[PDB]
Amino acid sequence: MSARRTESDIQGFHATPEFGGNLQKVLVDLIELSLQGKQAHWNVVGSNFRDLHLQLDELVDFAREGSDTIAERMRALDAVPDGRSDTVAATTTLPEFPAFERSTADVVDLITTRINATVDTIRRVHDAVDAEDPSTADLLHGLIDGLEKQAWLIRSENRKV
Amino acid sequence: SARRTESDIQGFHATPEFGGNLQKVLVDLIELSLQGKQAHWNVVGSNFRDLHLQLDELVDFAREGSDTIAERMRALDAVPDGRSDTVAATTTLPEFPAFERSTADVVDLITTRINATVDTIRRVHDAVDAEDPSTADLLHGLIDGLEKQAWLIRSENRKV
Amino acid sequence: MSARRTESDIQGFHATPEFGGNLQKVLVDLIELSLQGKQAHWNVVGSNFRDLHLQLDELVDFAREGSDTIAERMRALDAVPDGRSDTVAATTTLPEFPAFERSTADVVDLITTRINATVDTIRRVHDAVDAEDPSTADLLHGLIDGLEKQAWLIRSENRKV
Amino acid sequence: SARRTESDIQGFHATPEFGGNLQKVLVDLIELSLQGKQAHWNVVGSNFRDLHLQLDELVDFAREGSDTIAERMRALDAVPDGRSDTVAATTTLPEFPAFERSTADVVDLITTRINATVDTIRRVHDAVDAEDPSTADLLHGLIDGLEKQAWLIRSENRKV
Amino acid sequence: SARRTESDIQGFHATPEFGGNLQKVLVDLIELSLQGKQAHWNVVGSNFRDLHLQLDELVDFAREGSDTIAERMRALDAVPDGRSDTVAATTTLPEFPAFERSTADVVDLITTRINATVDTIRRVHDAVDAEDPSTADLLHGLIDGLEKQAWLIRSENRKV
Amino acid sequence: MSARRTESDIQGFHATPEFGGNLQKVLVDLIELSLQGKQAHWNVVGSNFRDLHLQLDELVDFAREGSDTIAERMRALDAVPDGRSDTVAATTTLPEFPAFERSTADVVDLITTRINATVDTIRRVHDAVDAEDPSTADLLHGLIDGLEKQAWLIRSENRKV
Amino acid sequence: MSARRTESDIQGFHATPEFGGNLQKVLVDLIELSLQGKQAHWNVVGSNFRDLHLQLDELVDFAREGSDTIAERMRALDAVPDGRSDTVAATTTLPEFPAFERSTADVVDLITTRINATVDTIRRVHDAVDAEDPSTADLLHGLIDGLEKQAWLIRSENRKV
Amino acid sequence: MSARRTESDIQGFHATPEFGGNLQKVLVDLIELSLQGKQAHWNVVGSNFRDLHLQLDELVDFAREGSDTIAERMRALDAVPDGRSDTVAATTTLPEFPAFERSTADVVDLITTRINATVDTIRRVHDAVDAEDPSTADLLHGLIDGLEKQAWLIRSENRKV
Amino acid sequence: SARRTESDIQGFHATPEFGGNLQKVLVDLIELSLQGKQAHWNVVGSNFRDLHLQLDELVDFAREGSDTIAERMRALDAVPDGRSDTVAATTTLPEFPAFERSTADVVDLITTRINATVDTIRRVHDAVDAEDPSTADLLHGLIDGLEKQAWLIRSENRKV
Amino acid sequence: SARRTESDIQGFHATPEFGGNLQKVLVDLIELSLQGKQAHWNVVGSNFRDLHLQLDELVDFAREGSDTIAERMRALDAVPDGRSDTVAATTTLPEFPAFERSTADVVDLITTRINATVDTIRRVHDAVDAEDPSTADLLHGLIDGLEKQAWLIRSENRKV
Amino acid sequence: MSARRTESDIQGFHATPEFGGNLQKVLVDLIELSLQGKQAHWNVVGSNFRDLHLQLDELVDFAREGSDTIAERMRALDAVPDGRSDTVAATTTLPEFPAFERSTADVVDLITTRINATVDTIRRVHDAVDAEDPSTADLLHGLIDGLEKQAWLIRSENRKV
Amino acid sequence: SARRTESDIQGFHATPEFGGNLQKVLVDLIELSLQGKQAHWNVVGSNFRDLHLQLDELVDFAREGSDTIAERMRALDAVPDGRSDTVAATTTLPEFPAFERSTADVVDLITTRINATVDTIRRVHDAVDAEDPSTADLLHGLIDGLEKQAWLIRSENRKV
Ligand SMILES: [Cl-]
Ligand SMILES: [Cl-]
Ligand SMILES: [Cl-]
Ligand SMILES: [Cl-]
Ligand SMILES: [Fe+2]
Ligand SMILES: [Fe+2]
Ligand SMILES: [Fe+2]
Ligand SMILES: [Fe+2]
Ligand SMILES: [Fe+2]
Ligand SMILES: [Fe+2]
Ligand SMILES: [Fe+2]
């Protein structure tokens, strides 16, 4: 017991209310993106349907794993996520996805915009998150990298060169 | 030969009522999946881990269920709406509460909400079956799986 | 606005006593079939031993998965299964499997008869089950299909020309 | 105690009408698989790869389906005929054309071929269900799987 | 050179006493598996899920074990009897009770049932080892595996 | 310095009409074999049913993979396969598979004869194929090897002493 | 060779003695945590035994992978780890784990405390590690994230709400 | 304080020459069995060819794994195996496998006799092996168990009523 | 015995011409793999995803191809040179352009460069086969695989 | 029936001597695993990679071994102590040195320490076997596996 | 739509030309390392050939995944990679790999130097990359960690202690 | 239409000379596998582990190869002889020596044994190819695989 601490209770790192709020912002936009991605996945029609149909599911998988990561990171830091439908709809920054069947061209533009909005949220909170807890900023970097890759993989369809 | 002579052969298309009935199932499955994740993250207390894990299995089932229904709608020339505003405004599920919740409360809450989801499917079943028995089979898989989830979750709170 | 239900307690579907009894009938024949299938698997000897030995294990696997399906369906619908040895022996409708070694030809006939008996139980309760709960009848269809396939794969050894 | 005392208990035998109804399904599933491969090899043009790949998935499903139907026939002591001459002579599917075909044309042709196959299953469905509901469930799986493939393929040509 | 010149060399034959000793092990392993499933389905209450899951692991082990014993019997030209009537008539395990049972009760009941099964193996061990040490090693695997399951189950009720 | 070619358009190897026709001959016999293999797989009954039932499926798998190989080799070399039912029936060299159930012994002989016929087609076109394109002849060697192995595994049931 | 360096020997990045010492601190606490985790895994008894038994093994797996990561990172940077039992016991900051069987409730509190002590060590050295080598700080972030998740998954058992 | 041993050189368990010779006896019969098993696998023809063909390969797999186990156990205990063809032929106790094709019925009897012979060697050396090294006798028990299972699975083809 | 009496037995060694011929194949396979990755990253436009993915499959094939050839050289006592300066100075492939490129242009470009690579292999084939038929078989696998890639890629740009 | 009538049936419990003997094995397995990792990280020199890798395999074996023994103790109502202070104070293994060590030195060191570990198991074997043969089988697996590791490691330093 | 943005087009984060140039530097050295690694993998001979042969392939796998990561990160950020042979040869900082067979000892020294040159490039651009986009710096940290591990695993062969 | 009307079509029969040529390949592949194992067990010294491991990979390849050849014989109605006495009596490989051997010696010995095996395949190649080119392709796989193993093994002793 030469260097052994003798405390009965050793408490964990707790997130500030600001930090909790910042992760909550990321969470709702990740959930909204997952819901919009599925909507697009189902309703996309037209030239190169299959590629887009498939890529949109990969986007959804990533955004879902991301939302679970953020929410559980909140839990680890003694914060409380709210991923309920009403909260997501009321607080998401993503422009609304339109109803009905949409062409592959339209879906490419729509989804690129919504991914970019999501990435913007993460980029906006990044410095405040990093200042308080660099380990959480690393989770943000994974999200930024993965989502920006998805945006490139989707938007390239509409590029005329 | 017995070969048909039509250059174009069309598929079975669902009635508006049929599409509307699948839409009802869809929003309740999506809502259940969102509430399941909420519960999964925020459950605390005795037997946390079991409930945390089971809730993820519920969510997995509800998500594949929503996809199954939405794609069945698409196959039948109906158009699903799984957007957050639509889900929130049209789900029949009792609202799941915010904040940390005890294991016992989560068991009771989620059981009610699974039962609400099964009720929607059972309510639309006969109208769906009458128009398209193949879709009713998909409904049966959902009823079976969700009722299995209800049993696996609720049993925690059962006394003798 | 909101279609949300307001009850704090929504109950699940509860099977009638008759429905419970009907699934219990299926359950005991499936367990008995599993036990007889293993008996035959160990004790078969003669021409084409290996094929029958192997096929019998596939039958046992299917019947075991089936009994779990039925028993858990009972539990889901607030019915209580009884798969105990005494109950199975006292209430199964299958003819007893004979003792000791049996020839491949005899095992083929014996097991085919026992599958047919098991399927007959499922067919007998089907309409009453389907009328109360269509979703459970679908599980019965899976059992009927899978077992009648086993009966074909086993019986065909003895079918001539 | 409750043990039946007969030494031979017969299984369920399909009527010859039932056998013939499943035979109708079988030949169209086989024809669909062969046309599917023809399309898979010979498709050219804009979005070749997706179509090439999706067509193989259709063929996998149709081949599993023909196995399922033929084996169900055998289970009920009917006897399938999936020989080339029989399939050509009795399939209801319009002939697939020869030579290379554009992706747009293949989309339309294959959608029609899938729809014709589903139509056969839908046509025999009630007669099959009346004699054996367990077989009708297999038909439901086929209907669902095939109509999903029709949606996944035809969507390429959909303009909105 | 060192080649034996007899055309038929007989294998090791188990005595009928040895066969009977393995038969004792077999019926208790089968009874344990059936009681294990009964428990797995009918357990309710605090920590349901863990017990539900652990009980299935016990059943998997007991089923693999009964296969091992019955196949060892056959290898040595003994003939197993795992029929329901025989198992019910000759098992040494106390009967599992009917109906839903609390997790606490199931823990105690199943621990007792496992211990009874191990006791049978321990009782025949020396007689089995004396005739065939290779079979005794299979008994050792069973003892180790079953006592591990007893520990994993009973620990739930242990108060310290 | 640089060995780089300067053409903007380098064409691929194009098969002669004769070469295309030779691979077409192989293709139709492989498809016909696959169809007959399944027929036999469903309709075989009698002593050692299961082994033959299972082996026939392995044959069908090999023949199906083979037909895809040949058809795609045709496509690679700018030839156009025809695997349609009417063409296969009208142009296959295999004797017709008989209708209805057949005994294990008969299926063994029937299918062995049909494999032998399929291999004979491949052997007949081999030299002409090898002379134009050695790489395609190698694919033929794979087919010859794999099918003659199937013929051994199936025929040996009927071989005595 | 337009931008090619012409040095025969190009040396790697070497950790300072302070950096080596900082990683050594993390290493001993990760090893101590793995040893305490196993002790808890074996000796935990009581209500919800299985969940805790299983979670404790997941903790041990993570802490073991973590110690290997830290030690090998030391090796890469020309530092030398010491993970020997005497060194771990003499230099760990973790409060000693008690002997004998312990209740699930006690184990939850004990292990949460020990995880939190381990995380505290990583958090304490983080800034010095990051200042010298940001790539190693990223390995620390993985550890912080994974361990804090484990603490949440374990401690939640004892939460009364 | 410390129970640590102080020797810099601690030697391992070394087998007696007799022990080495006993394992060598097991080794050559296992290799011979593997070689004969393959011979039978290639050369069997007749009723139920496929089942025997397949089962013989499982026998060969088991016997090959067995020979490696024994040979490596020898190496561990400072004994030196000899698995060379000349040694195996000159010292195996198994009757020679006959040349050319053999019927399924004959292969069943022939291979069953050869397994019985292999097991008899293991049974003959068992007590002497167990007395010197119980851990090696356990490996023998695995061989006895696995081979006698193979003998059952193969011989049962020829067992009547 | 028929045992050979040589203490040392040497392996087949390739002629300088043979090694030179495999070297020619090697640099063109490496160049193709590097151009394939360039195209994979920089392709944009209609059907981007299909082409992006197919190009990775081409690269995978060319990389395993280069390894196969280089190691065959090693087996035969020849010494490969796959260094960047050597590849750049000695490849016969038309240079792949820098910057973003449309799907249609990438199809045409890569098809030409695959065909150039196949041409090298076909050009050395007879000299390789004459010296060592076993190596010609490796060449056949490369010809087959690359020509399959050419077909899968070029079909995108094919019109009716 | 042959059913036993006891409501409670107890399991086999180990003597204090037996628990003490397994404890002796446990600390030496844990010590070996810790020394194995030390060696794995700090080995340098000729054939580094082989030794680095083999040492991880040794560690894997010793860790699963320690778990096996500790859980066997638990099954038998004994209480393991695998804490660092206990391991350090009670292990019989010669101390592994600090700092980088050559491959040849690591081979010699680890071989000695494996042999020390095997010696503990062999020293307790007969007392363990006499009380509970099933546990002796677990000991045999450890002796076999560790002695295999000793051979695979030491062979590096063997001269002709 | 309470927090919903109402922009039709939301643009992504775009890398500066300096940032694009910095990632390009990393890319060419990763590709050069992969090409040199394979050259070494093929041509290494002598004492401990196999270990080095195998480790060199692991190095190549990592460097290849790394180059794909960097290039695609460039694409995501609207930069354009150039991984062509001429560009790699003209702009790599790695000392040239020698021609012909090389001893294992020489290869160890050569490859360690080339890995270290590659790591130096990443370390040199790190701060500028991190200042502009911390998410990309995290990708750099993965590369630094993985490559420095490879250098340790390779160089340790030549260490005399 | 194009259907052949004969009821029995014979397959390709190997001549007895062809059978004998494959038999030569078979015995050397078997001898190589047995010598490979001998080496694998008995190799000691510097870089033991790599050699131990590579020798097992050689044996796996040689065993798959002997199966391939024996099965090709059977496919063409030849009859293999892989019995120990036949292999010892007719193999062309120099005898592997008894006892422990250094890694350096094993490298040289095994390289020679591989080269002798390849030589047999190369010797029969043209006679085999003339009668059946499909079999010659299997010989090519063996040549390529074995010469790869020779390179991977001998490189250990190569000084440059
Ligand atoms: Cl795709
Ligand atoms: Cl089989
Ligand atoms: Cl769990
Ligand atoms: Cl290795
Ligand atoms: Fe229905
Ligand atoms: Fe269904
Ligand atoms: Fe149904
Ligand atoms: Fe060839
Ligand atoms: Fe940072
Ligand atoms: Fe990271
Ligand atoms: Fe960072």
Ligand SMILES: [Fe+2]
């Ligand atoms: Fe033992």
Ligand SMILES: [Fe+2]
């Ligand atoms: Fe050739």
Ligand SMILES: [Fe+2]
């Ligand atoms: Fe080939």
Ligand SMILES: [Fe+2]
């Ligand atoms: Fe023993």
Ligand SMILES: [Fe+2]
């Ligand atoms: Fe054992």
Ligand SMILES: [Fe+3]
């Ligand atoms: Fe989907």
Ligand SMILES: [Fe+3]
């Ligand atoms: Fe279950």
Ligand SMILES: [Fe+3]
């Ligand atoms: Fe294909």
Ligand SMILES: [Fe+3]
């Ligand atoms: Fe081995």
Ligand SMILES: [Fe+3]
């Ligand atoms: Fe390689």
Ligand SMILES: [Fe+3]
């Ligand atoms: Fe454990």
Ligand SMILES: [Mg+2]
């Ligand atoms: Mg596409």
Ligand SMILES: [Mg+2]
């Ligand atoms: Mg058979």
Ligand SMILES: [Mg+2]
């Ligand atoms: Mg629990």
Ligand SMILES: [Mg+2]
């Ligand atoms: Mg080595």
